[PDB]
Amino acid sequence: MVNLGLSRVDDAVAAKHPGLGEYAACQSHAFMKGVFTFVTGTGMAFGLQMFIQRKFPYPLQWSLLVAVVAGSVVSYGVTRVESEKCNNLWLFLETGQLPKDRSTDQRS
C-alpha cells in the first residue's frame, strides 16, 4: 500500500512537467467551475436575506457571518472530501483511467 513516498515524488514531477497533471486539474477545475456557477446560480435567496440583513446596524450580516463561518467549516470539509476525491482522481488520471465527460456550457 502506498501512503506517502513515490506519490509525492510523482506529484512533484508532475508539477515540473505540466501536461497530464495540468490537464487533470484543468478537468476538475472546469467541472468545479461549472458546479460553482450552478450552485451559485441561486444567489437570489442570499440576495433577499442580505437585503433584509442589511436592516442591521452591524457591518457583517448574520447571513454573511453564518455563510463565512459555515463557509469556512464547510469549506474545510468539502476540501477534505474534494481533496481526497480530487486526489484519487489525480491518480486515476495519472494512470490514464477511464474518462468522465461532463456538460457545463457556461455563460457570462
Side-chain angles (χ1 to χ4, degrees):
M1 258 131 170
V2 299
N3 271 260
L4 47 113
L6 78 303
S7 278
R8 256 160 111 193
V9 173
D10 250 306
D11 267 52
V13 179
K16 233 106 258 178
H17 262 270
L20 262 140
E22 262 235 318
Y23 209 99
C26 258
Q27 206 87 336
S28 65
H29 152 244
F31 164 91
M32 187 175 186
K33 203 189 142 106
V35 175
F36 201 75
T37 41
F38 191 89
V39 65
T40 204
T42 170
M44 274 113 150
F46 260 52
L48 201 69
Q49 257 246 265
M50 188 215 183
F51 186 92
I52 208 277
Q53 271 289 342
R54 211 146 166 72
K55 92 174 253 108
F56 247 72
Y58 242 61
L60 297 137
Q61 285 63 49
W62 186 48
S63 217
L64 175 78
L65 206 139
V66 88
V68 165
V69 163
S72 216
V73 177
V74 175
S75 271
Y76 265 111
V78 96
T79 269
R80 267 252 166 71
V81 53
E82 290 261 36
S83 281
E84 187 205 285
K85 227 176 204 107
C86 177
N87 178 27
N88 276 324
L89 258 123
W90 181 300
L91 215 145
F92 273 129
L93 259 127
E94 187 124 61
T95 257
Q97 218 243 350
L98 245 67
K100 227 221 121 96
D101 301 46
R102 239 276 101 162
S103 247
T104 282
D105 205 62
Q106 231 197 298
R107 204 261 235 191
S108 197

XYZ file of all heavy atoms in Angstrom:
834
model
N 0.823 -1.198 0.000
C 0.000 0.000 0.000
C 0.866 1.261 0.000
O 1.886 1.317 0.684
C -0.903 0.000 1.236
C -2.331 -0.407 0.872
S -2.908 -1.675 1.989
C -4.635 -1.723 1.538
N 0.428 2.241 -0.776
C 1.151 3.498 -0.874
C 0.484 4.536 0.031
O -0.715 4.786 -0.083
C 1.231 3.943 -2.336
C 1.980 2.911 -3.181
C -0.164 4.210 -2.905
N 1.291 5.114 0.909
C 0.794 6.120 1.834
C 1.389 7.480 1.467
O 0.656 8.424 1.175
C 1.204 5.797 3.271
C 0.157 4.914 3.954
O -0.677 5.373 4.718
N 0.248 3.625 3.639
N 2.713 7.539 1.492
C 3.414 8.769 1.166
C 4.864 8.442 0.801
O 5.659 8.076 1.665
C 3.281 9.780 2.306
C 3.550 9.244 3.714
C 4.818 9.865 4.303
C 2.335 9.451 4.620
N 5.164 8.587 -0.482
C 6.504 8.312 -0.972
C 6.635 8.689 -2.450
O 6.869 9.851 -2.779
N 6.479 7.685 -3.300
C 6.577 7.897 -4.734
C 5.396 8.749 -5.202
O 5.423 9.308 -6.297
C 6.698 6.559 -5.467
C 5.400 5.768 -5.637
C 4.749 5.484 -4.282
C 4.443 6.482 -6.594
N 4.385 8.822 -4.348
C 3.196 9.595 -4.659
C 3.549 11.081 -4.754
O 3.208 11.742 -5.734
C 2.104 9.376 -3.609
O 1.359 8.187 -3.855
N 4.228 11.563 -3.724
C 4.632 12.959 -3.680
C 5.722 13.229 -4.719
O 5.812 14.332 -5.256
C 5.153 13.337 -2.293
C 4.115 14.156 -1.522
C 4.393 14.116 -0.018
N 4.844 15.446 0.450
C 5.397 15.672 1.649
N 5.570 14.660 2.510
N 5.777 16.912 1.988
N 6.522 12.204 -4.970
C 7.603 12.317 -5.935
C 7.014 12.475 -7.338
O 7.452 13.330 -8.106
C 8.542 11.115 -5.812
C 9.583 11.116 -6.934
C 9.216 11.083 -4.439
N 6.031 11.638 -7.630
C 5.377 11.674 -8.927
C 4.631 13.001 -9.081
O 4.630 13.596 -10.158
C 4.358 10.540 -9.062
C 4.753 9.429 -10.037
O 5.049 9.774 -11.200
O 4.747 8.259 -9.596
N 4.015 13.427 -7.988
C 3.267 14.673 -7.988
C 4.226 15.838 -8.241
O 3.938 16.720 -9.050
C 2.586 14.907 -6.638
C 1.145 14.400 -6.545
O 0.939 13.211 -6.873
O 0.282 15.213 -6.148
N 5.347 15.805 -7.536
C 6.350 16.847 -7.674
C 6.813 16.913 -9.131
O 6.978 17.998 -9.684
C 7.504 16.576 -6.707
N 7.009 15.737 -9.710
C 7.450 15.649 -11.091
C 6.383 16.260 -12.002
O 6.707 16.993 -12.937
C 7.776 14.196 -11.444
C 8.215 14.071 -12.904
C 8.839 13.627 -10.501
N 5.136 15.938 -11.699
C 4.020 16.447 -12.479
C 4.035 17.977 -12.445
O 3.791 18.625 -13.461
C 2.712 15.865 -11.939
N 4.327 18.508 -11.267
C 4.378 19.949 -11.087
C 5.531 20.520 -11.913
O 5.536 21.705 -12.244
C 4.509 20.274 -9.599
N 6.483 19.653 -12.222
C 7.640 20.056 -13.003
C 7.324 19.903 -14.492
O 7.797 20.684 -15.315
C 8.883 19.285 -12.557
C 10.031 20.240 -12.224
C 10.250 20.329 -10.713
C 9.648 21.617 -10.146
N 9.828 21.671 -8.678
N 6.524 18.890 -14.794
C 6.139 18.624 -16.170
C 4.630 18.825 -16.327
O 3.853 17.888 -16.148
C 6.601 17.232 -16.604
C 7.897 17.228 -17.379
N 7.946 17.340 -18.757
C 9.189 17.126 -16.954
C 9.216 17.305 -19.134
N 9.984 17.172 -18.015
N 4.251 20.085 -16.672
C 2.850 20.420 -16.857
C 2.322 19.863 -18.180
O 2.677 20.355 -19.250
C 2.797 21.938 -16.788
C 4.219 22.416 -17.033
C 5.144 21.219 -16.894
N 1.484 18.844 -18.064
C 0.903 18.215 -19.237
C -0.307 17.358 -18.859
O -1.431 17.655 -19.261
N -0.036 16.313 -18.092
C -1.089 15.413 -17.654
C -1.745 15.977 -16.393
O -2.961 16.158 -16.349
C -0.542 13.994 -17.482
C -0.773 13.040 -18.655
C 0.459 12.167 -18.903
C -2.035 12.202 -18.441
N -0.911 16.238 -15.397
C -1.395 16.778 -14.137
C -2.162 18.084 -14.359
O -3.181 18.326 -13.714
N -1.641 18.889 -15.272
C -2.264 20.165 -15.586
C -3.656 19.943 -16.182
O -4.617 20.598 -15.782
C -1.386 20.985 -16.534
C -0.553 22.009 -15.761
C -0.773 23.421 -16.309
O -0.814 23.547 -17.552
O -0.896 24.340 -15.472
N -3.719 19.017 -17.128
C -4.978 18.701 -17.782
C -5.989 18.136 -16.782
O -7.171 18.472 -16.834
C -4.654 17.628 -18.823
C -5.584 17.639 -20.038
C -5.186 18.257 -21.206
C -6.820 17.029 -19.966
C -6.062 18.267 -22.349
C -7.696 17.039 -21.109
C -7.273 17.657 -22.245
O -8.100 17.666 -23.324
N -5.487 17.290 -15.896
C -6.332 16.675 -14.886
C -6.939 17.766 -14.002
O -8.152 17.809 -13.808
C -5.513 15.662 -14.082
N -6.066 18.622 -13.490
C -6.501 19.711 -12.632
C -7.424 20.640 -13.423
O -8.402 21.157 -12.882
C -5.278 20.440 -12.073
N -7.081 20.826 -14.689
C -7.866 21.684 -15.558
C -9.247 21.051 -15.740
O -10.233 21.753 -15.952
C -7.167 21.923 -16.899
S -6.380 23.575 -16.908
N -9.273 19.729 -15.649
C -10.516 18.992 -15.801
C -11.410 19.202 -14.576
O -12.559 19.620 -14.706
C -10.247 17.505 -16.036
C -11.395 16.856 -16.811
C -11.189 17.003 -18.320
O -10.497 17.890 -18.795
N -11.827 16.089 -19.045
N -10.847 18.902 -13.415
C -11.578 19.053 -12.168
C -11.901 20.528 -11.925
O -12.871 20.851 -11.242
C -10.783 18.482 -10.992
O -9.582 19.211 -10.756
N -11.068 21.385 -12.498
C -11.252 22.819 -12.352
C -12.472 23.264 -13.160
O -13.333 23.979 -12.649
C -9.978 23.573 -12.739
C -10.225 24.966 -13.265
N -9.907 25.347 -14.558
C -10.762 26.065 -12.662
C -10.241 26.619 -14.714
N -10.771 27.062 -13.537
N -12.509 22.823 -14.408
C -13.609 23.167 -15.292
C -14.923 22.679 -14.677
O -15.874 23.448 -14.545
C -13.358 22.570 -16.678
N -14.934 21.405 -14.318
C -16.115 20.805 -13.721
C -16.527 21.554 -12.451
O -17.705 21.853 -12.258
C -15.749 19.366 -13.353
C -16.724 18.706 -12.375
C -17.786 17.999 -12.847
C -16.530 18.829 -11.034
C -18.691 17.387 -11.939
C -17.435 18.217 -10.127
C -18.496 17.509 -10.598
N -15.535 21.837 -11.621
C -15.780 22.546 -10.376
C -16.280 23.966 -10.643
O -17.049 24.516 -9.856
C -14.487 22.604 -9.559
C -14.742 23.196 -8.171
S -13.252 23.121 -7.192
C -13.886 23.674 -5.619
N -15.822 24.521 -11.756
C -16.213 25.868 -12.137
C -17.706 25.885 -12.472
O -18.446 26.738 -11.985
C -15.323 26.384 -13.269
C -15.315 27.915 -13.305
C -14.602 28.429 -14.557
C -15.303 29.669 -15.116
N -14.510 30.885 -14.831
N -18.105 24.931 -13.300
C -19.496 24.826 -13.706
C -20.401 24.562 -12.500
O -21.487 25.132 -12.398
N -19.920 23.699 -11.618
C -20.671 23.353 -10.423
C -20.813 24.593 -9.538
O -21.854 24.800 -8.916
C -20.001 22.179 -9.706
C -20.703 21.875 -8.380
C -19.960 20.940 -10.602
N -19.752 25.386 -9.511
C -19.745 26.600 -8.713
C -20.750 27.619 -9.255
O -21.440 28.286 -8.485
C -18.337 27.190 -8.809
C -17.985 28.148 -7.668
C -17.694 27.657 -6.433
C -17.962 29.490 -7.890
C -17.367 28.546 -5.375
C -17.635 30.378 -6.831
C -17.345 29.888 -5.596
N -20.800 27.706 -10.576
C -21.709 28.632 -11.231
C -23.159 28.184 -11.033
O -24.054 29.016 -10.890
C -21.301 28.736 -12.701
O -20.976 27.398 -13.067
C -19.990 29.503 -12.892
N -23.346 26.873 -11.031
C -24.672 26.306 -10.854
C -25.156 26.485 -9.413
O -26.238 27.021 -9.180
C -24.563 24.810 -11.161
C -25.913 24.101 -11.286
C -26.540 24.039 -12.491
C -26.486 23.534 -10.191
C -27.793 23.382 -12.606
C -27.739 22.875 -10.306
C -28.366 22.814 -11.512
N -24.331 26.024 -8.483
C -24.661 26.126 -7.073
C -24.937 27.589 -6.723
O -25.877 27.889 -5.987
C -23.544 25.509 -6.228
C -22.246 26.303 -6.372
C -23.962 25.404 -4.759
N -24.101 28.462 -7.265
C -24.243 29.887 -7.019
C -25.296 30.487 -7.953
O -25.474 31.703 -7.994
C -22.863 30.531 -7.164
O -22.950 31.719 -6.381
C -22.601 31.040 -8.583
N -25.965 29.607 -8.681
C -26.995 30.033 -9.613
C -28.296 30.366 -8.877
O -29.301 30.695 -9.505
N -28.233 30.270 -7.558
C -29.392 30.556 -6.731
C -29.022 31.536 -5.615
O -29.409 31.344 -4.463
C -29.944 29.227 -6.213
O -30.917 29.608 -5.245
C -28.910 28.435 -5.410
N -28.279 32.564 -5.996
C -27.853 33.574 -5.042
C -29.027 34.460 -4.620
O -28.989 35.083 -3.560
N -30.043 34.487 -5.471
C -31.225 35.286 -5.199
C -31.623 35.191 -3.725
O -31.858 36.210 -3.076
C -32.382 34.799 -6.074
C -32.355 35.475 -7.446
S -31.992 34.272 -8.713
C -32.873 34.993 -10.088
N -31.689 33.960 -3.240
C -32.056 33.720 -1.856
C -31.168 34.568 -0.943
O -31.667 35.284 -0.075
C -31.945 32.224 -1.550
N -29.868 34.461 -1.170
C -28.906 35.210 -0.379
C -29.098 36.717 -0.563
O -28.800 37.499 0.337
C -27.514 34.820 -0.880
C -26.808 33.779 -0.009
C -27.445 32.623 0.320
C -25.543 34.008 0.434
C -26.791 31.657 1.128
C -24.888 33.041 1.242
C -25.526 31.886 1.572
N -29.595 37.078 -1.737
C -29.831 38.476 -2.053
C -30.936 39.059 -1.168
O -30.782 40.146 -0.613
N -32.023 38.310 -1.064
C -33.153 38.738 -0.257
C -32.735 38.782 1.214
O -32.975 39.771 1.903
C -34.370 37.852 -0.525
C -35.730 38.454 -0.165
C -36.084 39.610 -1.102
C -36.818 37.377 -0.145
N -32.116 37.694 1.653
C -31.663 37.596 3.029
C -30.688 38.729 3.351
O -30.691 39.261 4.459
C -31.026 36.231 3.300
C -31.983 35.322 4.075
C -31.443 35.024 5.475
O -30.800 34.017 5.719
N -31.739 35.955 6.378
N -29.876 39.066 2.359
C -28.897 40.128 2.522
C -29.582 41.486 2.683
O -29.234 42.259 3.575
C -27.973 40.162 1.302
C -26.810 41.131 1.523
S -26.376 41.925 -0.016
C -24.981 42.901 0.521
N -30.544 41.735 1.806
C -31.281 42.987 1.839
C -31.961 43.186 3.195
O -31.937 44.283 3.750
C -32.352 42.904 0.751
C -33.133 44.204 0.545
C -32.714 45.107 -0.382
C -34.243 44.456 1.287
C -33.438 46.314 -0.573
C -34.966 45.662 1.096
C -34.548 46.566 0.170
N -32.554 42.108 3.688
C -33.239 42.151 4.968
C -32.206 42.196 6.095
O -32.456 42.779 7.149
C -34.227 40.987 5.085
C -35.394 41.349 6.006
C -33.517 39.708 5.535
C -35.022 41.128 7.474
N -31.066 41.571 5.835
C -29.994 41.533 6.814
C -29.306 42.896 6.901
O -28.656 43.206 7.899
C -28.987 40.430 6.482
C -29.390 39.106 7.132
C -29.188 39.155 8.648
O -28.471 39.988 9.178
N -29.859 38.220 9.314
N -29.471 43.675 5.842
C -28.873 44.999 5.786
C -29.636 45.964 6.696
O -29.260 47.129 6.825
C -28.877 45.545 4.357
C -27.671 46.455 4.116
C -27.167 46.326 2.677
N -26.234 47.433 2.365
C -24.992 47.529 2.856
N -24.524 46.585 3.684
N -24.217 48.568 2.519
N -30.692 45.445 7.304
C -31.510 46.246 8.198
C -30.864 46.276 9.585
O -31.436 46.821 10.528
C -32.953 45.738 8.204
C -33.166 44.703 9.309
C -34.637 44.296 9.404
C -35.295 44.895 10.648
N -36.222 45.985 10.270
N -29.680 45.686 9.664
C -28.951 45.638 10.919
C -27.904 46.753 10.987
O -27.310 47.114 9.973
C -28.240 44.284 10.973
C -28.768 43.347 12.061
C -29.990 42.765 11.923
C -28.017 43.096 13.166
C -30.480 41.896 12.932
C -28.507 42.227 14.176
C -29.728 41.644 14.038
N -27.704 47.278 12.226
C -26.740 48.344 12.440
C -25.308 47.804 12.400
O -24.352 48.558 12.569
C -27.111 48.946 13.785
C -27.968 47.905 14.485
C -28.389 46.874 13.450
N -25.208 46.502 12.176
C -23.909 45.852 12.113
C -23.372 45.841 10.680
O -24.136 45.962 9.725
C -24.136 44.410 12.571
C -23.367 44.031 13.838
C -23.602 44.708 15.018
C -22.435 43.013 13.801
C -22.878 44.352 16.209
C -21.711 42.657 14.993
C -21.967 43.343 16.138
O -21.283 43.006 17.265
N -22.024 45.691 10.574
C -21.374 45.662 9.275
C -21.614 44.324 8.571
O -22.144 44.288 7.461
C -19.906 45.927 9.562
C -19.711 45.633 11.041
C -21.086 45.545 11.684
N -21.212 43.257 9.246
C -21.377 41.921 8.700
C -22.805 41.440 8.960
O -23.365 41.692 10.026
C -20.302 40.981 9.251
C -18.856 41.335 8.897
C -17.940 41.181 10.114
C -18.366 40.514 7.704
N -23.355 40.756 7.968
C -24.709 40.238 8.076
C -24.694 38.843 8.703
O -23.772 38.063 8.469
C -25.399 40.219 6.711
C -25.813 41.629 6.285
C -24.588 42.531 6.111
O -23.617 42.182 5.462
N -24.690 43.705 6.727
N -25.727 38.571 9.487
C -25.844 37.283 10.149
C -25.713 36.191 9.086
O -25.174 35.118 9.355
C -27.150 37.191 10.943
C -27.278 35.920 11.784
C -26.376 35.389 12.619
C -28.418 35.036 11.838
N -26.848 34.232 13.206
C -28.130 34.011 12.716
C -29.652 35.101 11.168
C -29.025 32.974 13.003
C -30.536 34.057 11.467
C -30.260 33.017 12.347
N -26.216 36.500 7.900
C -26.161 35.559 6.795
C -24.726 35.439 6.280
O -24.280 34.350 5.922
C -27.099 35.984 5.662
O -27.717 34.865 5.033
N -24.043 36.574 6.256
C -22.667 36.609 5.791
C -21.758 35.987 6.851
O -20.772 35.328 6.521
C -22.271 38.035 5.400
C -20.809 38.237 4.994
C -20.562 37.738 3.569
C -20.389 39.698 5.170
N -22.120 36.218 8.105
C -21.348 35.688 9.217
C -21.506 34.167 9.261
O -20.530 33.443 9.455
C -21.739 36.386 10.521
C -20.666 36.418 11.612
C -20.641 37.776 12.315
C -20.855 35.265 12.599
N -22.743 33.727 9.081
C -23.041 32.305 9.099
C -22.497 31.658 7.823
O -22.071 30.505 7.841
C -24.544 32.088 9.285
C -25.268 32.077 7.937
C -24.820 30.801 10.065
N -22.529 32.429 6.746
C -22.045 31.946 5.465
C -20.517 31.885 5.492
O -19.913 31.055 4.814
C -22.573 32.847 4.346
N -19.935 32.775 6.283
C -18.488 32.832 6.407
C -18.014 31.702 7.322
O -17.135 30.926 6.952
C -18.061 34.217 6.897
C -16.608 34.204 7.377
C -18.269 35.272 5.808
N -18.618 31.644 8.500
C -18.268 30.622 9.472
C -18.605 29.243 8.898
O -17.769 28.341 8.911
C -18.968 30.903 10.803
C -18.974 29.658 11.692
C -18.321 32.087 11.523
N -19.830 29.125 8.409
C -20.288 27.873 7.832
C -19.526 27.606 6.533
O -19.264 26.455 6.188
C -21.802 27.931 7.619
N -19.192 28.690 5.847
C -18.465 28.587 4.593
C -17.036 28.096 4.826
O -16.487 27.359 4.007
N -16.473 28.522 5.947
C -15.117 28.135 6.298
C -15.083 26.660 6.700
O -14.295 25.884 6.160
C -14.571 29.006 7.431
O -13.178 29.265 7.281
N -15.946 26.315 7.644
C -16.024 24.947 8.124
C -16.400 24.024 6.963
O -15.725 23.025 6.716
C -17.002 24.858 9.298
C -17.160 23.412 9.772
C -16.563 25.768 10.447
N -17.474 24.391 6.281
C -17.947 23.609 5.152
C -16.855 23.553 4.082
O -16.709 22.546 3.390
C -19.265 24.187 4.629
C -19.721 23.457 3.364
C -20.348 24.142 5.709
N -16.114 24.646 3.980
C -15.038 24.734 3.008
C -13.972 23.678 3.308
O -13.463 23.027 2.398
C -14.415 26.131 2.999
O -15.083 27.009 2.098
N -13.666 23.541 4.590
C -12.670 22.577 5.023
C -13.132 21.147 4.738
O -12.400 20.361 4.138
C -12.531 22.763 6.535
C -11.385 23.691 6.945
C -11.661 24.923 7.504
C -10.077 23.297 6.755
C -10.582 25.795 7.890
C -8.998 24.170 7.142
C -9.304 25.376 7.689
O -8.286 26.200 8.054
N -14.345 20.851 5.183
C -14.914 19.529 4.983
C -14.994 19.186 3.494
O -14.566 18.110 3.078
N -15.545 20.120 2.733
C -15.686 19.929 1.300
C -14.299 19.799 0.667
O -14.132 19.104 -0.335
C -16.512 21.069 0.699
C -15.606 22.168 0.142
C -17.466 20.547 -0.376
N -13.339 20.478 1.278
C -11.972 20.447 0.787
C -11.327 19.092 1.091
O -10.464 18.631 0.346
C -11.221 21.629 1.405
O -11.391 22.679 0.457
C -9.708 21.404 1.445
N -11.772 18.493 2.185
C -11.249 17.202 2.596
C -11.768 16.100 1.670
O -11.008 15.229 1.248
C -11.649 16.878 4.037
C -10.568 17.329 5.021
C -9.821 16.126 5.602
N -8.585 16.579 6.282
C -8.571 17.255 7.438
N -9.722 17.562 8.051
N -7.403 17.626 7.983
N -13.060 16.174 1.381
C -13.689 15.194 0.513
C -13.298 15.479 -0.939
O -13.126 14.555 -1.733
C -15.203 15.193 0.735
C -15.779 16.603 0.587
C -15.897 14.214 -0.213
N -13.170 16.763 -1.241
C -12.803 17.182 -2.584
C -11.322 16.897 -2.843
O -10.926 16.629 -3.975
C -13.124 18.661 -2.804
C -14.635 18.889 -2.876
C -15.108 18.980 -4.328
O -14.535 18.242 -5.158
O -16.031 19.786 -4.575
N -10.543 16.967 -1.772
C -9.115 16.720 -1.868
C -8.851 15.219 -2.002
O -8.008 14.801 -2.796
C -8.375 17.283 -0.653
O -8.188 18.692 -0.749
N -9.586 14.448 -1.214
C -9.441 13.003 -1.234
C -9.895 12.443 -2.583
O -9.245 11.562 -3.144
C -10.218 12.358 -0.085
C -9.920 10.861 0.008
C -11.073 10.112 0.680
O -11.181 10.233 1.919
O -11.818 9.436 -0.061
N -11.007 12.978 -3.067
C -11.555 12.542 -4.340
C -10.696 13.100 -5.477
O -10.345 12.376 -6.408
C -13.033 12.920 -4.446
C -13.867 11.740 -4.950
C -15.357 12.087 -4.962
C -16.215 10.821 -4.889
N -16.831 10.690 -3.550
N -10.381 14.381 -5.365
C -9.570 15.044 -6.371
C -8.218 14.332 -6.444
O -7.603 14.267 -7.508
C -9.413 16.538 -6.079
S -8.305 17.305 -7.316
N -7.795 13.816 -5.300
C -6.527 13.110 -5.221
C -6.647 11.771 -5.950
O -5.808 11.438 -6.785
C -6.145 12.825 -3.766
C -4.837 12.035 -3.688
O -3.985 12.107 -4.558
N -4.726 11.280 -2.599
N -7.697 11.039 -5.607
C -7.937 9.743 -6.219
C -8.115 9.921 -7.728
O -7.723 9.055 -8.509
C -9.211 9.101 -5.666
C -8.929 8.364 -4.356
O -7.882 7.769 -4.160
N -9.920 8.435 -3.471
N -8.704 11.050 -8.093
C -8.938 11.353 -9.495
C -7.611 11.727 -10.160
O -7.394 11.427 -11.333
C -10.021 12.424 -9.639
C -11.413 11.922 -10.029
C -12.458 12.345 -8.994
C -11.785 12.380 -11.441
N -6.759 12.377 -9.381
C -5.460 12.795 -9.880
C -4.651 11.538 -10.206
O -3.962 11.486 -11.223
C -4.757 13.713 -8.877
C -3.391 14.218 -9.346
C -2.309 13.493 -9.662
C -3.001 15.593 -9.539
N -1.254 14.298 -10.043
C -1.690 15.615 -9.966
C -3.734 16.779 -9.360
C -0.996 16.798 -10.250
C -3.026 17.953 -9.647
C -1.705 17.993 -10.078
N -4.763 10.555 -9.325
C -4.051 9.302 -9.506
C -4.639 8.556 -10.706
O -3.901 8.028 -11.536
C -4.061 8.488 -8.211
C -2.805 7.660 -7.929
C -2.505 7.612 -6.431
C -2.924 6.261 -8.536
N -5.963 8.537 -10.759
C -6.658 7.864 -11.843
C -6.272 8.464 -13.198
O -6.009 7.733 -14.152
C -8.156 8.077 -11.615
C -8.800 7.030 -10.702
C -9.562 7.424 -9.648
C -8.610 5.705 -10.947
C -10.160 6.453 -8.802
C -9.208 4.735 -10.101
C -9.970 5.128 -9.047
N -6.250 9.787 -13.239
C -5.901 10.493 -14.460
C -4.418 10.273 -14.763
O -4.020 10.218 -15.926
C -6.297 11.968 -14.358
C -7.588 12.367 -15.074
C -8.544 13.087 -14.121
C -7.288 13.198 -16.323
N -3.639 10.153 -13.698
C -2.209 9.941 -13.836
C -1.929 8.532 -14.363
O -0.843 8.259 -14.869
C -1.487 10.183 -12.509
C 0.031 10.122 -12.690
C 0.693 11.411 -12.201
O 0.549 11.701 -10.994
O 1.329 12.078 -13.046
N -2.931 7.674 -14.227
C -2.807 6.301 -14.682
C -3.443 6.138 -16.064
O -3.145 5.184 -16.780
C -3.424 5.392 -13.617
O -2.300 4.835 -12.941
C -4.132 4.178 -14.223
N -4.309 7.085 -16.397
C -4.990 7.058 -17.680
C -6.327 6.323 -17.575
O -6.862 5.851 -18.578
N -6.831 6.249 -16.352
C -8.098 5.580 -16.103
C -9.164 6.082 -17.078
O -8.909 6.987 -17.871
C -8.545 5.774 -14.653
C -9.199 4.504 -14.105
C -10.663 4.755 -13.739
O -11.139 5.878 -13.714
N -11.347 3.651 -13.455
N -10.337 5.472 -16.986
C -11.443 5.847 -17.851
C -11.777 7.324 -17.636
O -11.596 7.851 -16.539
C -12.634 4.910 -17.634
C -13.026 4.036 -18.826
C -11.936 3.008 -19.136
C -14.388 3.377 -18.599
N -12.270 7.968 -18.728
C -12.629 9.374 -18.669
C -13.946 9.573 -17.915
O -14.466 8.636 -17.309
C -12.703 9.823 -20.119
C -12.839 8.552 -20.942
C -12.497 7.375 -20.043
N -14.447 10.797 -17.976
C -15.693 11.129 -17.307
C -16.210 12.470 -17.836
O -16.271 13.450 -17.097
C -15.511 11.098 -15.788
C -16.639 10.312 -15.116
C -17.105 11.008 -13.836
C -18.590 11.370 -13.918
N -19.413 10.328 -13.264
N -16.569 12.466 -19.111
C -17.077 13.669 -19.748
C -18.144 14.302 -18.853
O -18.631 13.669 -17.918
C -17.723 13.347 -21.098
C -16.794 12.681 -22.116
O -16.084 11.739 -21.704
O -16.816 13.130 -23.283
N -18.478 15.544 -19.171
C -19.479 16.270 -18.409
C -19.887 17.546 -19.147
O -19.103 18.102 -19.914
C -18.951 16.639 -17.020
C -19.835 16.043 -15.922
C -21.039 16.943 -15.639
N -22.245 16.397 -16.300
C -23.500 16.736 -15.974
N -23.721 17.623 -14.995
N -24.533 16.189 -16.628
N -21.115 17.973 -18.889
C -21.638 19.173 -19.520
C -21.429 20.380 -18.604
O -21.279 20.224 -17.392
C -23.121 19.015 -19.860
O -23.347 18.986 -21.266
N -21.425 21.554 -19.216
C -21.237 22.786 -18.470
C -21.883 23.962 -19.208
O -22.773 24.621 -18.674
C -19.737 22.971 -18.231
O -19.444 22.076 -17.162
C -19.399 24.351 -17.665
N -21.410 24.186 -20.426
C -21.930 25.269 -21.242
C -21.292 26.588 -20.800
O -20.549 27.207 -21.559
C -23.446 25.400 -21.083
C -24.167 26.047 -22.268
O -24.092 25.458 -23.368
O -24.777 27.115 -22.046
N -21.606 26.978 -19.573
C -21.073 28.211 -19.020
C -21.691 29.419 -19.727
O -22.048 29.341 -20.901
C -19.547 28.241 -19.116
C -18.919 28.588 -17.765
C -17.464 29.029 -17.933
O -16.609 28.283 -18.383
N -17.231 30.282 -17.550
N -21.797 30.510 -18.982
C -22.364 31.733 -19.522
C -21.938 32.935 -18.676
O -21.852 32.838 -17.453
C -23.892 31.661 -19.560
C -24.461 32.621 -20.609
C -24.953 33.915 -19.957
N -26.370 34.153 -20.311
C -27.020 35.302 -20.081
N -26.382 36.326 -19.497
N -28.305 35.427 -20.436
N -21.684 34.040 -19.361
C -21.270 35.259 -18.689
C -21.711 36.480 -19.498
O -22.745 36.446 -20.165
C -19.755 35.283 -18.477
O -19.368 36.241 -17.494
